[PDB]
Design a protein around this ligand. Structure first.
Ligand code: PLP
Ligand code: PLP
Ligand code: GLC
Ligand code: GLC
Lengths: 815, 815
């Protein structure tokens, strides 16, 4: 067979040019041949798919070229391991990054279809809980835009974060069947399935340890392309799916599901550790399959150069088993001596920490590890002993420090501290915001910092300006581009140039106009799909993020009740109208968080129907908060609520989304809020409350909520209302748990920041009364938000941790 | 929005002409855009998929046009309900029916690929057990070729008939993961999902019965196109998949699998009833979803005309619940009076019976029905009472007949006789071969025939000449076409014209040549994938079909042992060399059938390694017999073994496949064998053994196997060898169960036909010694096989049962 003939098999002149005529032809081909429909039976959903497949074609052509480029060049490859990737919708993002939205708009118009309506049909890919998962998605976009040979590796959950329904003011969870109609963006790769082992026992041969009698589960990969901004670079996100191997008869076949349950559902916990076996299986599953893939790719173009061609970033401790697994492969399978394998491992791995809350830290009981992964437990103990021997050498006689730094925690229930394991086996450990990285060094990881100061770094979080500005706020993007060009989209620091228009009346008018249109649009979306009626001239006070005690939605609640009581006291006095919106999901088994949601809706029941309040105050709970809803509400916000107790929010990212979209911020000196105020100037930020040091003082002497109750009349009145059933007539003591918690068991000191919060909120209202000054402060915010672009964050990771150089060089088009 | 614009959305000038240039372009598009591969990483499997998708495009264009045609014309629609559809491979069949194989051959050649190698990569769609499932697939091909508006409705099993492995001579079952790499022929239709109810209770309202508190399982359809032979008609096969509705949290999500287990696996029983709950769920599942689909289609272009636009054919009693379900919908939901609904039901339904063996008859215990389908049990009792009242009127005082005809069977375990239910609610009941249809009237359904003689018919089975001649035996098809043209492919009766070449030396030579090449090819396939070495000059003695006691593979075994003992007795005497091949799967829990497989392999262990036997006798067990293997072995056969006990094989279809492909038949006067000998002339058939009447005589007086053992020395010697461990040295009494069964509990009288069988086999050997005469008899067989084309069978069903006229009119091409 003449091999020269196969040269005809090329992507060389395929999808056609990105002009209207060709797009329509392809749309037509997909509607008929791909979906097997015709114009008579086709529904909007069918048209959405035909368009998605049409855009996919162009995306795929570049995907193939990028992967070919990497094979040829063989650059150092970056593997971002995460158990969460909160992607959201893909159609628009793809059109924008490929510069296809105009042609698609035109092509669909000529066919008698409306593209914006089609886009709203796409399901959100919710394979994440919140900030951690969304950060991974932003990073993927940035790594592609910066031309890095990066791969995101995770799990392809059949069901993502649940859909939230509000029934009788209570949250109800509904499985998120996001794959029901299919996912046009993913490509199954059954030919690349790999085995993953569980259980079994370790037996010692003359030449080494052997893991035998193990149960096998197959890992089948699904590839999703991730496009960079107009550089023709398309990277890969590889998600693993669990499959049972093919080796009474009926029952045996039915029992295959047991193995496939590993990738069935995403654990809905945000910043909380649940030590369940299934979760541990998920963690090893993603790790074992991923590392096999990494080693194979490395061997296809000894291990001394592994760290020069491979960098593995661990997103939190979830994929931490990658350390002992890499050691297992190198020592047991490749037969490298321990010290050499360890050297390679440490130089390859880097770990990112995302929280300081003790209940979020993964500490796995050893009994679960010895039965599920016997060989890894052995390796972990060995790692521990050799690590502790190093500590003893640097601090002779410090037996206390040895107990504190151990990877193994004593107590009746022996547990393995996964964070300690990550620090020991990583060459770099980073926090996600300056204040957080400092706290890591001053507190929880103080011992580790003293031993290896060089390991600790900071990499302040960021968000991608493509989805979080260009995509969700085209109106804002347009007026900014008309003054400074389009270069800021991949170089956000250029927003700085806007400081020159702070006094320009034209700009001031335009910024305020874009915001009003966004607010009008949002109020319309609310009436259409969720029936009620907010006043579009009120101040849009928004707090959207997962429901958590540390995020203090309750503090927000106390303020709106204060506002309501104030109006009732003096009904004929003027007040800046406000629409207070709070949204977010609560983990299913988090009782207090679910009680907080009920309190929010109960407050709205009273306030929203009080005739003397009228249009001056409206409290709305936005149900099913997710990425696509964030894209709608954030651009319509005036005030962003970032009120976590100082020292608890590692960084936050929603805060950056709001800053970039023209909302002013009211918050504590926590996480990235510190750096945002730093960039915009503290006078252009609404800061209040205790600083980290003040929280420490209170803790030393002891927090007594009663003191505040006794000294603040307005606060006392609120608690009295809550206990008397003022917000729950048919069940007077419904909120007894919330009241008791605030009075006697509040770890987040809500009462301690109440007074400063209310006073600060008063200043916000004062400034809103002056549109011109409000808008001028907003411009000072938008103009200094450049530091918070994920392109900056990724550039720092690449240079300071991965040892690779970013690049904006564009690759050639398929043809 | 100008609706005129949408007229651009058409299939009108799409796939391009069916010439080489366009095919290559599309192949290229699919390899890159559909599969996301390139010429560097593509494997043959990838190339196979690219070709399949390319051919699919042309198939889909006609599919859409056919469905449009039916909407316009609104012809009476035929619904073939079956729990099995044994489809086999689809690529080649599609190319042949669309007349694309030459262009595809050329296009692939020019790309440097070999099409025959690509075709061998396709997985068999094994959603069937054997004859019943394969008949449904042949019928689908014929209904399309005859231009009928037909739909096949069944279940999309995740795992079809198991893959059979032989380990140590024993059968081992392995799950058939046929969807592992995907199915390019099916199209998921999540938008057409329908609910199916289970359990619950019946409550009586003032206006009627209501089925409430039921559990819901969703039925999602998957459509597969089925092309007719060159008429551009593409029908639909709709297979249902079970899905759980979206309404601790983790466990709740994991438990969704329980509902999806309904369509997980095909029960591997052939002609045997297993009363398991899951099976019953499967039966109602397919029925409930299908009928909803039928009613919807009917209402979209009152019920008095239902029978004029709808015909429902029940393939065996598996889909029998369609009768009480249709009644439930018409009475409970549409509120028709009972008598009118019943009239409509009977006129709509027709039932096909496939077996007479009592252990194959479905008799469901009422306790299972009252808990799973309470409302259907009520309807069935009502149906029974009104049916029995009719019997009493026609035969006053015949209380015995009333007990015999009842749909309800008394005994401790009350059961519902599904066959009686089908007869009562169908306007037509048919057997599948003349002798079988007669037995139905003379025995098991005698009572029903006396009450309604007009209901009983016969519809002799057939096979499709496309797959069973043109596809699997191109060499034969070609030499036949060179003398009589290509019109026989859709009018098999034309093979008759070949009787004019019985004496032509050229033809005689060609027929014998085609067979030798087929045998050479098969012997090559055997050495390649299954290593051993059969002599291609020996007589190919083949028996392939499911392992069953009634099919009497054991009788075959006795003959080969007789042959072996004969050679050993007189080693230097000449004998016509023979390669005896036996293949077929055994149901997992059928102990005796699994013992028979072991006996076959044990016989081969001895015979195949006996040096004095040499190349004169070889016994081979063909493992994993399935549709694609049948396509390989049948065309290479010389002798077809159809030796079931007279009166047990309803029809048989493998027998017809062998006749059409140049093999002579040795068999009993059973099933369709009677009609085949009738068509070819009994002198051109090797008939032997008891006729149905002789079996009846033996039964009356009593079957005593000992008599034959005592009177036949050669038989006695064989049994002695089996009991002594001659075929199982390390375990002397391994075959004790087989020997005891043959001697004391043989329901199929193997010994009674032994003598005539051996004598008849002697005549076969005699004729084979004379190639010229052997081949001339073969021609007399091939030339008279026309009656056994499924086109004939379907034509008869359409005219005599469905009330629709067949048609060979070709529809216009897409463009
Ligand atoms: C940005 C984002 C988050 C993170 O919000 P924070 O206020 O940092 O906690 C959570 N959920 C979604 C859907 C997001 O878009
Ligand atoms: C034709 C066919 C059958 C039916 O064979 P019989 O000899 O009629 O029992 C069974 N299995 C397969 C795979 C078939 O092709
Ligand atoms: O690092 C991304 C996010 O991770 C976690 O969700 C932290 O709670 C949050 O503060 C941070 O922004
Ligand atoms: O009707 C199709 C087939 O159904 C069953 O398999 C019968 O056993 C067989 O005789 C018949 O040919």
């Amino acid at each position: 067979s003449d091999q020269e003939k196969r040269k005809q098999i090329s992507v060389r002149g395929l999808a056609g040019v990105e002009n209207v005529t060709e797009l329509k032809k392809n749309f037509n081909r997909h509607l008929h041949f791909t979906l097997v429909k015709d114009r008579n039976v086709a529904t909007p959903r069918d048209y959405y798919f035909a368009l998605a497949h049409t855009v996919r074609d162009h995306l795929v052509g570049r995907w193939i070229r990028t992967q070919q480029h990497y094979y040829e060049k063989d650059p150092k490859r970056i593997y971002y391991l995460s158990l969460e990737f909160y992607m959201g919708r893909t159609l628009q993002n793809t059109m924008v990054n490929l510069a296809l939205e105009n042609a698609c708009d035109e092509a669909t118009y000529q066919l008698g279809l409306d593209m914006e309506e089609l886009e709203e049909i796409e399901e959100d890919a919710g394979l994440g809980n919140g900030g951690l998962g969304r950060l991974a998605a932003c990073f993927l976009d940035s790594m592609a835009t910066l031309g890095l040979a990066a791969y995101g590796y995770g799990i392809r959950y059949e069901f993502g974060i649940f859909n939230q329904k509000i029934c009788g003011g209570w949250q109800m969870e509904e499985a998120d069947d996001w794959l029901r109609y299919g996912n046009p963006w993913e490509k199954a790769r059954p030919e690349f399935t790999l085995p993953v082992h569980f259980y079994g026992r370790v037996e010692h041969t003359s030449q080494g340890a052997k893991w035998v009698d193990t149960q096998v589960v197959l890992a089948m990969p699904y590839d999703t392309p991730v496009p960079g901004y107009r550089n023709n670079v398309v990277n890969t996100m590889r998600l693993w799916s669990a499959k049972a191997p093919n080796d009474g008869y009926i029952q045996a076949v039915l029992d295959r599901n047991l193995a496939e349950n590993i990738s069935r559902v995403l654990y809905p916990n945000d910043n909380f550790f649940e030590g369940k076996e299934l979760r541990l299986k998920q963690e090893y599953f993603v790790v074992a399959a991923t590392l096999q893939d990494i080693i194979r790719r490395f061997k296809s173009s000894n291990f001394d150069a592994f760290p020069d061609k491979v960098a593995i970033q661990l997103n939190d401790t979830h994929p931490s088993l990658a350390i002992p697994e890499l050691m297992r492969v190198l020592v047991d399978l490749e037969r490298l001596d321990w010290d050499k394998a360890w050297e390679v491992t440490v130089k390859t791995c880097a770990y990112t920490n995302h929280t300081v809350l003790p209940e979020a830290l993964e500490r796995w009981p050893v009994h679960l590890l010895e039965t599920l992964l016997p060989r890894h437990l052995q390796i972990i103990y060995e790692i521990n002993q050799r690590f502790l021997n190093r500590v003893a050498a640097a601090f002779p006689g410090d037996v206390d420090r040895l107990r504190r730094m151990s990877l193994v925690e004593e107590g009746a229930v022996k547990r393995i501290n996964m964070a300690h394991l990550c620090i020991a086996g990583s060459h770099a450990v980073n926090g996600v915001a300056r204040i957080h990285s400092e706290i890591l060094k001053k507190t929880i990881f103080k011992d580790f910092y003293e031993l290896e100061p060089h390991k600790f770094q900071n990499k302040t979080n960021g968000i991608t300006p493509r989805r979080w500005l260009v995509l969700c706020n085209p109106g804002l993007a347009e007026i900014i581009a008309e003054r400074i060009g389009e270069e800021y989209i991949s170089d956000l620091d250029q927003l700085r140039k806007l400081l020159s228009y702070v006094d320009d009346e034209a700009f001031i008018r335009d910024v305020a106009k874009v915001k009003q249109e966004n607010k009008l649009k949002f109020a319309a979306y609310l009436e259409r799909e969720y029936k009620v009626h907010i006043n579009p001239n009120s101040l849009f006070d928004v707090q959207v993020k997962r429901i958590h005690e540390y995020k203090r939605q309750l503090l927000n609640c106390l303020h709106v009740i204060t506002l309501y009581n104030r109006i009732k006291k003096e009904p004929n006095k003027f007040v800046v109208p406000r629409t207070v919106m709070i949204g977010g999901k609560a983990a299913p088994g988090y009782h207090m968080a679910k009680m907080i949601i009920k309190l929010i809706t109960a407050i709205g029941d009273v306030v929203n129907h009080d005739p003397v309040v009228g249009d001056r105050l409206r409290v709305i709970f936005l149900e099913n908060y997710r990425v696509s809803l964030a894209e709608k509400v954030i651009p319509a916000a005036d005030l962003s609520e970032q009120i976590s107790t100082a020292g608890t929010e590692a960084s936050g990212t929603g805060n950056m989304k709001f800053m970039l979209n023209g909302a002013l911020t009211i918050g504590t000196m926590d996480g990235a809020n510190v750096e945002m105020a730093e960039e915009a100037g503290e006078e252009n930020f609404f800061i209040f409350g205790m600083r980290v040091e003040d929280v420490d003082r209170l803790d030393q002497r002891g927090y007594n909520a009663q003191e505040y109750y006794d000294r603040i009349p307005e606060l006392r009145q609120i608690i009295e209302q809550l206990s008397s059933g003022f917000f729950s007539p048919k069940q007077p003591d419904l909120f007894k748990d919330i009241v008791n918690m605030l009075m006697h068991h509040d770890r987040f000191k809500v009462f301690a920041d109440y007074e400063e919060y209310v006073k600060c909120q008063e200043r916000v209202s004062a400034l809103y009364k002056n549109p011109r000054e409000w808008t001028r402060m907003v411009i000072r915010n938008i103009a200094t938000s450049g530091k918070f672009s994920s392109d900056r964050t990724i550039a720092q990771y690449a240079r300071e941790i991965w040892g690779v150089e970013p690049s904006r060089q564009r690759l050639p088009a398929p043809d």
